[model samples]
Target: GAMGSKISEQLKCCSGILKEMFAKKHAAYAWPFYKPVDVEALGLHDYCDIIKHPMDMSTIKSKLESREYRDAQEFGADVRLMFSNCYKYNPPDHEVVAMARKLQDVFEMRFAKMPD
Candidate 1:
């Protein structure tokens, strides 16, 4: 019972990140300047479907956890630092701050599920 609960909790957190990946991938079309990638051509659409199957969690979680870790640590780190520098030099107002917070929330939501 003890380990079951712990594992469930861990998986829930991991699943949240997996959910975010799905959200972000498909949401690429939401941005004003962006368009949906060709589902077959980009291969992202097929990749996104892994989360739809309940039984795929083991493989999906492992792959996503690895990606989350690498993306958070190495890939996105520089971008965050660069943004911080830019914000430092060009101070943003309340509206810009709100948008920044929203974006940070998205990143943090994803970061929480990353492997240790």
Candidate 2:
């Protein structure tokens, strides 16, 4: 119970960053200047029959806890992959590029500060 509570508190710290990032992401798409990548086509979608959504938490917590330590290099690569996917169709939308860069920055900042 204590661990969970700790984790919850840690998550709260990250929650703010996560909330802000998600909000910016959502806001970026509001004008519809560019359509987002198709969730289904990207294999990110789940089905009613059996598919489940992919997902994280916990620490002060560095926004990077879940993204790194678990696998920092892999997480970096994954972020790159997302960036690649965005440009896979178009030549790197400025908005998407900015979002991707911020994602990486936050991840690194969090991971770097995490206790070794």
Best candidate according to TM-score: 2
**CA-lDDT, candidates in order:** 0.43, 0.42
Model 1 global lDDT (CA atoms, 0 to 1): 0.43
Residue 40 of model 1: what lDDT? 68
lDDT by residue for model 2 over 1-116, one digit each (tens)?
74543344344444444444445554544222123444577574432233222122122124355434243344434444444554443336667556555555655566455333
| Alpha carbon lDDT at 33, candidate 1 | 12
lDDT of 1 by residue, 24-67 (tens): 56344212112222346746454335322222223444554555
Predicted structure 2: lDDT:
0.42
Off by over 4 Å in 1: 1-71
The estimated TM-scores of all candidates read 0.35, 0.37
